[PDB]
Paper text:
The epidermal growth factor receptor (EGFR) is an important therapeutic target for non-small-cell lung cancers (NSCLCs). In the presented work here, we studied the binding mode of the SKLB compounds to EGFR kinase by solving their complex crystal structures.
Since previous structural studies have revealed that considerable P-loop conformational changes and N-lobe/C-lobe relative orientation changes mainly occur in EGFR kinase structures in active versus inactive states, we intentionally studied two major types of the EGFR kinase structures, i.e. the active conformation structures (the L858R structures) and the inactive conformation structures (the T790M/V948R structures). The isopropyl (SKLB(3)), cyclopentyl (SKLB) and cyclohexyl (SKLB(6)) groups on the N-9 position of purine is sandwiched between Leu 718, Val 726 and Leu 844 side-chains, and are located within hydrophobic interaction distances to these side-chains.
Author numbering: 697 to 866, 876 to 990, 1004 to 1020
Amino acid sequence: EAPNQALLRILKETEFKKIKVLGSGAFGTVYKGLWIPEGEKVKIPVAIKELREATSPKANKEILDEAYVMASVDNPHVCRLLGICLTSTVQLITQLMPFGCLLDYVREHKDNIGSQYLLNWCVQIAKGMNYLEDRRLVHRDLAARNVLVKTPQHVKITDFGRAKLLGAEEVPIKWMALESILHRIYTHQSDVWSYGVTVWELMTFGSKPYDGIPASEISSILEKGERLPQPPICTIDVYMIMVKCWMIDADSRPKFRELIIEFSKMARDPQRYLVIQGDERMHLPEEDMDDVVDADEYLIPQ
Ligand SMILES: CC(C)n1c(Nc2ccccc2)nc2cnc(Nc3ccc(N4CCN(C)CC4)cc3)nc21
Ligand SMILES: [Cl-]
């Protein structure tokens, strides 16, 4: 096992300003903000995630594990941590994704969303996921809600709070592989099953999974051999791939690098694998912004 030499960057609260609340849930809230690095003359659009005024020690121990992971990843399809702030309670700063999470995005734009885009996201997510596998990381919470849109073309994975290294002792039931539900067993392959669900979410345009069914129920349903329905826009090819992600024997399930390859192919003839009405028709998208630099553009030594 190699040494992790990721640099953890420490930021002063003076370096950045919160502007809106992007989302508020549970313990903590995420802000849209601007970060200007010290003496750099660049402004970077950022999200800032912080917990409640309650500063309880256990919660911090959870946010710092997350930061740790996000600090340790470098892929175009994975969200990375810019740095952290220690001023009262910990905050995580990372690059902002303007269009929000993918799940919201498909629901909002279904009528302008096309086969090429859906296939591309699939390729992209599988890429981010393959990277994590390379780094031996199990996301353990992959959902459409945890994919973020920089742009319609570009998406990245996020929410590494539940992330573990593979083979480590250390709840979203619906996205969970059966082995995980029965035995709390997680492997990259468990991760793969979740990918299949995420894909199902996009093809059904944000439809809820096993809607109307209680989670306690779900283990039984899966046990019986039940699985998610084939989406209307889905060819048998595409659905066939999803179904492979949901096999009892996890070694029979596809590898993320296979998934990249198969969806990659489909993306060269997108109309053959996804049937959507008016597919051809569809197209998709504070005073001084001169100095605005995206995080992807902004780079540091190392
Ligand atoms: C809001 C959460 C999902 N988030 C975290 N979370 C996060 C997790 C760990 C560390 C740092 C951030 N990083 C984020 C980075 N970027 C964005 N962007 C973004 C998020 C939400 C929205 N909207 C606008 C449309 N609304 C209908 C729904 C809310 C627009 C843009 N969100 C992030
Ligand atoms: Cl759930």
